[PDB]
Amino acid sequence: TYKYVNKKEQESEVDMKSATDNAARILMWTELIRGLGMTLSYLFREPATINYPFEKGPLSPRFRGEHALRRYPSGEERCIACKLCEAICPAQAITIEAEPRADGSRRTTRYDIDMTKCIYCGFCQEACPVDAIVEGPNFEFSTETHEELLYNKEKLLNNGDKWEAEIAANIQADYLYR
Amino acid sequence: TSVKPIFSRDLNEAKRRVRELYRAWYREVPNTVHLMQLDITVKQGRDKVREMFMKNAHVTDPRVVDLLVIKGKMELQETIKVWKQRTHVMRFFHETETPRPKDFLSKFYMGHDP
Amino acid sequence: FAYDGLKRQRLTEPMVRNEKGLLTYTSWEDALSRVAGMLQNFEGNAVAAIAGGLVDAEALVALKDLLNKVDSDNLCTEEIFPTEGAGTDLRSNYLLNTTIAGVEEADVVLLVGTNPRFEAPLFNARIRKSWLHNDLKVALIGSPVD
Amino acid sequence: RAEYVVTKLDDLINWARRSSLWPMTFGLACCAVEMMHMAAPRYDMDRFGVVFRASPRQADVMIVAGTLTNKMAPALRKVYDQMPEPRYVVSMGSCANGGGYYHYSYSVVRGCDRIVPVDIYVPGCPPTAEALLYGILQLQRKIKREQKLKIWYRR
Amino acid sequence: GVQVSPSGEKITHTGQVYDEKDYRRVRFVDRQKEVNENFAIDLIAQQPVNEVEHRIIACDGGGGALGHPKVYINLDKETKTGTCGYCGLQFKQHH
Amino acid sequence: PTTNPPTARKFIWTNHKFNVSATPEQYVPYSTTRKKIHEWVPPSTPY
Amino acid sequence: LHHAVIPHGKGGRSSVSGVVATVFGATGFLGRYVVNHLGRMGSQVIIPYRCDVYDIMHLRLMGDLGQLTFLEWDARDKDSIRKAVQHSNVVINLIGREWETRNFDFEDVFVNIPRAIAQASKEAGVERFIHVSHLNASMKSSSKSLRSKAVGEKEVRSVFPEAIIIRPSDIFGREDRFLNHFANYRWFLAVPLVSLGFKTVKQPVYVADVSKGIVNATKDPDAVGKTFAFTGPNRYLLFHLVKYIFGMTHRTFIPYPLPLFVYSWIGKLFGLSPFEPWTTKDKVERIHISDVMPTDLPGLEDLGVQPTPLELKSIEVLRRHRTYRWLSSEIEETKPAKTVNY
Amino acid sequence: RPTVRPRSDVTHKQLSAFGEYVAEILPKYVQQVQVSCLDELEICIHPDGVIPTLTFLRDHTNAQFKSLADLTAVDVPTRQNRFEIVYNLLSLRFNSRIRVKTYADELTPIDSIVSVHIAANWYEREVWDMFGVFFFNHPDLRRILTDYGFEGHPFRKDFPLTGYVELRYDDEVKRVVAEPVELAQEFRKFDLNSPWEAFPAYRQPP
Ligand SMILES: CCCCCCCCCCCCCCCCCC(=O)OC[C@H](COP(=O)(O)OCCN)OC(=O)CCCCCCCCCCCCCCCCC
Ligand SMILES: NC(=O)C1=CN([C@@H]2O[C@H](COP(=O)(O)OP(=O)(O)OC[C@H]3O[C@@H](n4cnc5c(N)ncnc54)[C@H](OP(=O)(O)O)[C@@H]3O)[C@@H](O)[C@H]2O)C=CC1
Ligand code: SF4
Ligand code: SF4
Ligand code: SF4
Ligand SMILES: [Zn+2]
């Protein structure tokens, strides 16, 4: 199936009624007036703009933004230093050098994202078998400097010690889809 | 060893092809300094042309000299035209990186570089 | 499990003795200058070296050729080996002249009063491999060890 | 009094520079698509006095969207060195901040900051058009808190 | 358990405090040091021991899909307690 | 969050901070690593 | 030294040099090159600014991601010098404006800034206090700055001994105050230079020669007190030094000689400018005190640099001052100056 | 079978039949026509015979392949002629694609098909820029994608992932100039390559 878009030319011996119809399109250029009334149809509409800091537009629970390290309901940093979250991070952004915690437990001494890296792809929150690293719904965390985007572990736990009321609602809204 | 040549035969025919190229830079260094504003006088601009030809003299294979000419015709087509910049042509000089000491003794007052 | 050792009590900077008598930290420009001063000064037979343990077969030469250019042979090592007859000569008096694989192709082993188990532990394993498989008999000479 | 007059002049001098700042018709990558959605009828620049003028001489801020390659880099500082010098800079993306993808490639500069100095950094691979908008509202107060006549009086 | 070093900086989960003779303490000048006050070494210790009835039992983190792949412990030791490597939750056998 | 409020977990913050941009009370990176090497201890005993 | 002041790194731009340094006057002309020659090789460079955050943007580059950290201060307080030089191995002094401000005079700037620093720097425990006086400033000079820039050269030695003191000549470079001074005399009828230029022998020096000299002075085991003098070759004469400029800058050149009876008073007319003045009482007189012969001092060549002649790097600093129809003129052209040995 | 992409046996005979056709019509410069499980055809040739089997495939009633799609150059540095140079073509008339690949050294060029397929004016230039395979009889060979002073042929596997130079602005000379490469993270080559063939009897017997 194919459809011609510009193919109508056939000289039908244009009658004098179909001439003025064409000779008044020209000499009154009215096809354009059908455009001026078309833009006049929109100043009388409601402009879709929104007062940003007072009206921040709509998102969804899977909007992935600023990373954060979640935490079990009884402290206990939810990371267990697997290293299958830098083995997949394609931007090569994460370095999670670890040790035994001196409790005998197994936790990070090091964790890192270079947020000037971190394509914000979601591979690390879907790979984490424990739901430690997530990618929160922040999108206002711009910075005046380059060093404030090198979130190591203390800027990134306490970040997860901030949005956990707001993360878990979205994680609870989505653990059926994943 | 019964290999296929390109743009030449035994080396003596592939050095006029090199001199025809030196025959194009030496007349077009004074042109570039005029066109695009450069600090160079003319002589440290031309001496660099010889410096970058008196780097690959150790070659003894026609096909290789047939090939290095071509890349020079690129970078002359890119310089007789202003597709390059002050930046790109004043990149040959290596003015920034400090020339590391060739001598043994100072070469490991910094770095494990054999 | 000794890789913990390469990150502990390990020398980093070139130190040098102080006007008080303590060790300070300085640069290669200052230490080699002091060492070289005490090598252009004393020469020949009062200038010597004691290697030992964990040493290349490359620094042994450079440390040999350096001290031979000030005509010294006092190049010594920590653990004694004889010299009374053909000590350093004739490379059959300080080697496994048999292959270490050769322990398989053998019916007898006299072990002088040493532990292959704890001196070169894995020369004892070929002995155990050749203790089990091919019927070998051993005679250890001195110091009963388990 | 003189200081109080100068603080208010320096608070009044900036109201113009921060309200009517005219960014520059940059591009280079996906990130630039979100600037269009910040010119769109949802998050309007023009409501913030922010207007695309496609020449630096008419400009007041560079918005660097996209991978700043090594071939584009002379054309990026040939352009930053064509404005007047109340000039500001904004680095949209993780390709422009550090080179997020392509940090280890050979034809990519590992940050807009290698070349032009920057006032603010907007992260996000495609930062939401409401995330440059948070930045060029933050750049819009980063020079509300500049004191250019105060430090002339005490000098 | 953020406890200050004799220099003045704070200690993290891990002792990492820059020494007094270190040059990389400038970066906190006119600034400060983001350090989490809630050490998981202690909060997990501030948590009782589930004195369960069975010898082999299960741990999760409150939701099978919401964390902690389901591993099982052997509670034969009465002296020590059995723990999951994922959380730090302790258990006992009661008999 | 008046009729569907969240669950509190005795670590979550109570006093939320805005984007600390260029003031103090901002972020500065570390090397949270425990220094991974140990050099030597010269004695205070000459010979 | 410690474990991270170690220079374990090749070259620079991501390496270490153990040159954690304070450089106070890094908002102007010389310090922007010093930071460049420290940051390029890999070095933390503490840059205290008293000024606009907008004027320190060009210092945000020439820094490899953590080695450039800034902080605020003012000369008229304590506890803002005892924070910069705390975590340092090196300190560098580049302060000095060119004139008297309403609040900081020649003595408040060339004597009391190094004194407070160098004392506040000796207490911290740093090893080096590279200081920059100005050559021709012994004492009893015709000016008022150089009569005070030797006072600082003594009030530092009496405070922080074993300090390096560089005494450079009159410096030139892009956005300088030396060649771009005489270049802008063309806005008037002509150049009013004294005695038809003669009786003023000058050997200027390029910035990077000074900066590469400083950066290598903060690393040698030498220079534990050695004074210096960064002067450069080609000891020019002023009339021919300016004729070179206005042949390079092809506008025109005619003298208009004067005594100091008036040419030091015209500076007092332009000295009545609340902004950066075009001339002063004393900016006229440095040009005319400028007379020296090198006697014994170490200099550049025994510090790491082979200095640069003005014959070569003069395009870059005067190519702007030209008109179209001279905007490309090839220093092949333009008749190099006459150099005097004496 | 519900997850295994049915083989569709019909269009594997159509192409293999056309494979013998292209070989016996043209024994010169042709070796091992092959056709994969994926129903697509491969006709490897000697590099002296490129144009005689691109004009043929552009100008022939039963092999109308007048539209070029790609011209790659695969690097395999375990053979003399490392640069395999792959053409792939398309019949509007037959709705069939094909692959016509060749070989080359670091110095054994291949004549250009710009007369046959003008589309390869730039696909050849990038192969020169990326790999360094010269092309006889080509209007304006030169770079497209790399810088104007980029010494190197980057897609050569000999070339490092981050190159030898990187650029930055030098206030002392007021230009974006190069000093050699100096990383901050050192790209961590991971050893993700398992044992365990995964494809037995689809392997290399010694
Ligand atoms: C009784 C006996 C005596 C009577 C004697 C009098 C006899 C009658 C005279 C009739 C005159 C008819 C009107 C004359 C003007 C017509 C001009 C004209 O013909 O324009 C034609 C031109 C198109 O030309 P062309 O190149 O051929 O394009 C078609 C190609 N397919 O068209 C164009 O290209 C113009 C397009 C420009 C559009 C710009 C938009 C204009 C915005 C409109 C403002 C609206 C308000 C109007 C205000 C008016 C001023 C008060
Ligand atoms: N460049 C030249 O022509 C020559 C200079 N010298 C010497 O070299 C050194 C460099 O001076 P240069 O940098 O060239 O001159 P600048 O004009 O560049 O001034 C340098 C810095 O000094 C700072 N400064 C001056 N006075 C004060 C003050 N009272 N309180 C705080 N900061 C102050 C300024 O800070 P802000 O930017 O905030 O004003 C400026 O950044 C000086 O010792 C000078 O005498 C010697 C020979 C030639
Ligand atoms: S995958 Fe999750 S638990 Fe494992 S190291 Fe990464 S963040 Fe920690
Ligand atoms: S979101 Fe993607 S790019 Fe970002 S840290 Fe996670 S895995 Fe890496
Ligand atoms: S950061 Fe992401 S969206 Fe922006 S240019 Fe790079 S790949 Fe495109
Ligand atoms: Zn558990």
Render H85-118 in DSSP notation, one character per residue.
Answer: -EEEEE-TTT--EEEEE----TT------TTT-T
Is D76 within 8 Å of D118 (Cβ atoms)?
A: no
Breaks in chain C (C to N over 2.5 Å), named by the residue before each, are none
Axis crossing angle, helix G31-39 with helix G207-217, rounded to the nearest 10: 50
Q: Write the CA distances from A6 to A3, A9, F2, integer angstroms.
A: 9, 9, 60
Q: Which of H172, H174, H179 is facing G13, going by the closest CB pair?
A: H179
Q: Does A60 touch chain D (CB under 8 A)?
A: no
- Rounded Cα gap, residues A30 and A21, in angstroms: 11
Ligand approaching nearest to the C-alpha of A80: 3
Cα G280 to chain center, whole Å?
18
Q: Which chains touch F (3 or more CB pairs under 8 A)?
A: A, C, D, E, G
Tokens of G301: 């060549």
- Rounded Cα gap, residues G176 and C39, in angstroms: 53
Q: Which of F36, F39, F42 is facing C23, going by the closest CB pair?
A: F42
Ligand approaching nearest to the C-alpha of A118: 4
D146 contact residues in G (CB cutoff 8 A):
52-54
User: Torsion angle of alpha carbons C123, C127, C128, C134, nearest 10°?
Assistant: 150
Interstrand relation of G227-228 and G165-166 (parallel, antiparallel or unpaired):
parallel
Element (H, E) at D90: strand D88-92
**Other Cβ atoms closer than 10 A to G14:** 17
Residue C66: HSE in the Cβ half-sphere, 13 Å Cα cutoff? 14
Q: How many residues does chain D have?
A: 155
Interstrand relation of A133-135 and A67-69 (parallel, antiparallel or unpaired):
antiparallel
**Other Cβ atoms closer than 10 A to C4:** 7
3-state class (DSSP) for residue A81: coil
Amino acid letter for position G183: A
| Residue whose pair of structure tokens reads 């008044």 in the numeric block | A24
Q: Whose CA is closest to atom 2 on ligand 3? A: A128
Q: What are phi and psi of A147, to 5 degrees?
A: -75, -25
Tokens of G87: 């975590």
Q: Which stretches does DSSP call E strand in chain G?
A: 21-23, 45-49, 68-72, 90-93, 128-132, 165-166, 171-172, 201-202, 205-206, 227-228, 236-237
CB burial of residue A61 (10 Å; 0-12, 13-18, 19+): middle
Element (H, E) at A157: helix A154-160
Q: How many residues does chain A have?
A: 178
Is D129 within 8 Å of D42 (Cβ atoms)?
A: yes
Interstrand relation of E50-51 and D120-122 (parallel, antiparallel or unpaired):
unpaired
Axis crossing angle, helix B62-80 with helix B16-25, rounded to the nearest 10: 20
Cα A94 to chain center, whole Å?
21
Choose which residue among D31, D33, D35, D90 to substitute to test ligand 5 binding: the one with the highest number of ligand atoms within 8 A of its C-beta. D31
Choose which residue among A20, A22, A26, A36 to substitute to test ligand 1 binding: the one with the highest number of ligand atoms within 8 A of its C-beta. A26
Minimum-distance ligand 3 atom for the alpha carbon of A86:
6
Cα G160 to chain center, whole Å?
22
- Rounded Cα gap, residues B23 and G183, in angstroms: 40
3-state class (DSSP) for residue D44: coil
Spell out the residues 6+ positions from residue G147 whose beta carbon is closer than 8 angstroms to its own: G137, G139, G140, G141
Q: Write the CA distances from G336 to B104, G170, G198, G310, G312, integer angstroms.
A: 41, 20, 18, 10, 10
Tokens of D103: 């940090």
* Ligand 3 centroid distance, CA of G104 (Å): 58
Q: Does G193 touch chain D (CB under 8 A)?
A: no
Is A86 within 8 Å of A93 (Cβ atoms)?
A: yes
For ligand 4, residues with CB inside 6 Å are A 89, 91, 93-94, 113, 118-124, 135
G40 contact residues in H (CB cutoff 8 A):
170, 179
- Rounded Cα gap, residues C121 and B53, in angstroms: 61
Find out whether A121 is annotated in a ligand binding site. Answer: yes
Tokens of C35: 């060492």
Tokens of E60: 């999760």
Nearest Cα to B85, choosing from C58, G47, H203, D71? Answer: D71
Residue of A nearest to G64 (CA): A146
Spell out the residues 6+ positions from residue F8 whose beta carbon is closer than 8 angstroms to its own: A165
* Cross-chain residue pair B39–G316, CB shorter than 8 Å: yes
Which resolution, in Å, applies to this structure? 3.3
Domain ranges within chain E, ordered by starting residue = 1-95
Spell out the residues 6+ positions from residue G281 whose beta carbon is closer than 8 angstroms to its own: G144, G264, G267, G268, G271
CB burial of residue H157 (10 Å; 0-12, 13-18, 19+): exposed
N- to C-terminal Cα separation, chain D: 17
Q: Which stretches does DSSP call E strand in chain C?
A: 15-17, 23-25, 49-50, 75-76, 108-112, 137-141
Cα C130 to chain center, whole Å?
29
How many separate domains does chain B show?
A: 1
CB burial of residue D108 (10 Å; 0-12, 13-18, 19+): buried
Q: What are phi and psi of E34, to 5 degrees?
A: -65, 110
Give the closest-approach CA distance of C55 to chain G in angstroms. 24
DSSP assignment letter at A30: H
- Rounded Cα gap, residues G136 and G291, in angstroms: 7
Q: What are phi and psi of G51, to 5 degrees?
A: -135, -165
CA-based Rg of chain F, rounded to a whole angstrom? 23
How many separate domains does chain G show?
A: 1
Buried b / exposed e over G288-313, threshold 16 CB at 10 Å, is: bbbebeeeeeebbeebebebbebbeb
Give the closest-approach CA distance of H57 to chain B in angstroms. 27
Tokens of A79: 């990371």
Interstrand relation of H83-84 and H74-75 (parallel, antiparallel or unpaired):
antiparallel
3-state class (DSSP) for residue G178: coil
* Cross-chain residue pair F30–A148, CB shorter than 8 Å: no
Structural biology method used: cryo-EM
Q: Does F18 touch chain D (CB under 8 A)?
A: no
* Ligand 6 centroid distance, CA of H84 (Å): 54
Task: Give the helix ranges, DSSP H, for H4-76.
Answer: 10-24, 55-58
G87 contact residues in E (CB cutoff 8 A):
22-26
Ligand approaching nearest to the C-alpha of A96: 3
Fold topology of D1-155: Rossmann fold (3.40.50)
Question: What range defines the domain where residue G88 resides?
Answer: 1-342
Minimum-distance ligand 2 atom for the alpha carbon of G101:
29
**Other Cβ atoms closer than 10 A to G154:** 12
Question: What range defines the domain where residue B97 resides?
Answer: 1-114
Spell out the residues 6+ positions from residue B4 whose beta carbon is closer than 8 angstroms to its own: H108
Q: Which of F24, F26, F32 is facing E14, going by the closest CB pair?
A: F32
Q: Whose CA is closest to atom 20 on ligand 1? A: A27
Q: Does F34 touch chain C (CB under 8 A)?
A: no
Interstrand relation of D61-65 and D88-92 (parallel, antiparallel or unpaired):
parallel
Residues within 5 Å of ion ligand 6, judged at the Cβ atom:
E 59, 68, 84, 86-87
Query: Using alpha carbons only, what angle is made at residue D134 by residues D129 and D135, rounded to the nearest 5 degrees?
Result: 100
Residue of E nearest to G124 (CA): E21
Amino acid letter for position A56: K
Q: Which chains touch C (3 or more CB pairs under 8 A)?
A: F, G
Tokens of C14: 């070139």
Spell out the residues 6+ positions from residue H121 whose beta carbon is closer than 8 angstroms to its own: H114, H138, H139
User: Torsion angle of alpha carbons A20, A24, A25, A29, nearest 10°?
Assistant: 170
The two counts, helices (H) then strands (E), for chain G are 11, 11
Is E11 within 8 Å of E37 (Cβ atoms)?
A: no
